[PDB]
Amino acid sequence: MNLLDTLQRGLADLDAQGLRRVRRTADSACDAHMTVNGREIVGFASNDYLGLAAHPKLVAAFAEGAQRYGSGSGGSHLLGGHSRAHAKLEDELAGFAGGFSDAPRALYFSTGYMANLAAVTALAGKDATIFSDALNHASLIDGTRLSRATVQVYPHADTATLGALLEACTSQTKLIVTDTVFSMDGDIAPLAELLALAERHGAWLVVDDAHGFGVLGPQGRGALAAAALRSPHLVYVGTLGXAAGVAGAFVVAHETVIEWLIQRARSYIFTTAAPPAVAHAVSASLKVIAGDEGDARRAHLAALIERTRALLRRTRWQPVDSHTAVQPLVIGSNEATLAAMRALDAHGLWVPAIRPPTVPAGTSRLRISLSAAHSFDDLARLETALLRASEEA
């Protein structure tokens, strides 16, 4: 009983702090309009930035992929589970997103969480120093903890400070690690200056483009293509369960880097390869992302972003200066953020509250996440509800 009682007290303490998390259950596919807890809503909670999670081509690819390659991979990519579906997808990803490299190769992972663990731990050992943006994603931070390296945190996007830290650092191996698009803020890292610093100081630059892949850059090729950056120092992590509408993740880097991850990365080696139908569906998604339809979805998303920037600034609260689909509205306390979320729920809209530990204390926020599936009428409803929530506050 004592073990369970300690957890019970912890749960009660979270409740009292306004930090209790509650799952909601979707009864229909992820989409702008969908059924959640048995009610019809307009959803702004998901990361489905291009509206692809419900796309008929991806649905059909699940069926076809399972029919061609079965249900389970049966094991590790290094022990029987590596399918032609995975191999083809790796070739496709290297060709699509590897333009920053003179000798690209891609490596497919079942989750972005584990791709990040692999990139950080394989490249930074006990004598290395990692320099990490203060607002990096949890999986990057877990990667830095698993690695044997010393970890220096630099203030968010503060390249002046990072440069001073790199100059002061005497490690032979240095790694700079950053989100590209920050998951709870929507700003974009200063990638050109970060790369200039990595080249000046002999460091790897590991960039996590989970929220930029598919939505930034020419044909959606991501943040490095948008920034037109090229270097052997770059190690690119993309994920496939956000704008790409399926699941999984990938690392693109110099061929030699990928060889090293295959040989050494524990979160690549010691896990079951994802079902080959999932890879087959990602291959279908990349064709949608890269072509005229992907261009049209990105263009409509950009229009929604313009209108959302305007409507958020009509409230009393402080939006982040974001030009991406991630449109957060900072409210402050946990209680005021939950109250604003509940007010929007009453208008049939789901805009989720975000609270510590995800964001710093005192910066709890609503996270409006836009999708190309959203309409201008959806935003008009969001505007009306937020103005009422703001007036009521």
Q: Annotated binding residue at 183?
A: yes
Q: In terms of DSSP H, where are the helices of 291-375? A: 292-312, 334-345
The answer to the question of residue 370 being in a domain is yes
Residue 199 lies in a domain: yes
Q: Check if the beta carbon of residue 139 is closer than 8 Å to that of residue 116.
A: yes
**Are 273 and 298 part of one and the same domain?**
no
Same domain assignment for residues 67 and 90: yes
Q: What's the helix, strand, coil split of the chain in %, to 5?
A: 45, 20, 40
Please check whether residues 170 and 205 belong to one and the same domain. yes
Query: Among 275, 290, 305, where does a domain finish?
Result: 290
Structural domain contains residue 7: no
User: Is residue 19 in a domain?
Assistant: no
What is the helix (H) or strand (E) element at residue 42, kind and residue range?
strand 39-43
Same domain, 30 and 96: no
The answer to whether the CB of 217 falls within 8 A of the CB of 228 is no
In the chain, what is the straight-line distance between the N-terminal and C-terminal CA atoms, in Å?
43
Distance between CA atoms of 225 and 221, rounded to whole angstroms? 6
Residue 113 in marked binding region? yes
Whether residue 141 sits in one domain with residue 38:
no
387 belongs to a structural domain = yes
**CATH number of the domain that residue 230 is part of:** 3.40.640.10
Of 229, 224, 282, the residue nearest 108 (C-alpha): 282
| Residue 113 and residue 124 in one domain | yes
| 158 plus 262 within the same structural domain | yes
List helix spans (H) across 240-331: 255-264, 266-269, 276-290, 292-312
> Any binding-site annotation on 25?
no
- The resolution, in Å, is 1.6
145-176 core/surface letters (b: 16 or more CB in 10 A; e: else): ebbebebbebebbebeebbebbeeeebebbbb
CATH assignment of the domain containing 325? 3.90.1150.10
- Is 4 part of any domain? no
| Cβ-contact 177, 144 below 8 angstroms | yes
Report if residue 39 sits inside a domain. yes
Does residue 6 fall inside a structural domain? no
Task: Single out the residue in 261, 290, 319 at which a domain terminates.
Answer: 290
Q: Does one domain contain both 230 and 243?
A: yes
111 is in an annotated binding site: no
Same structural domain, 148 and 249: yes
Same domain, 34 and 119: no
The answer to whether residues 202 and 339 touch, using CB atoms and an 8 Å cutoff, is no
Please spell the DSSP secondary structure of 201-232, one letter per residue: HTEEEEEE-TTTTTTSSGGG--HHHHHT---T
CA dist 162 and 159 (Å) reads 5
How was this structure determined? It was done by X-ray
Question: Both 91 and 151 in a single domain?
Answer: yes
| 358 known ligand binder | yes
Tell me the sheet residues that pair with 237: 208, 251
Q: Is 21 annotated as a binding residue?
A: yes
Number of domains in the chain: 2
Structure tokens of 126? 């006990």
Q: What is the DSSP string of 117-181?
A: HHHHHHH--TT-EEEEETT--HHHHHHHHHSSSEEEEE-TT-HHHHHHHHHH---SSEEEEEESB
Mark whether 156 and 277 lie in a shared domain. Answer: yes
Last residue of a domain, one of 272, 290, 308: 290
In angstroms, rounded to a whole number, what is the distance separating the alpha carbons of residues 98 and 79?
27
The answer to whether the beta carbons of residues 93 and 238 sit under 8 Å apart is: yes
Give residue 204's domain range: 57-290
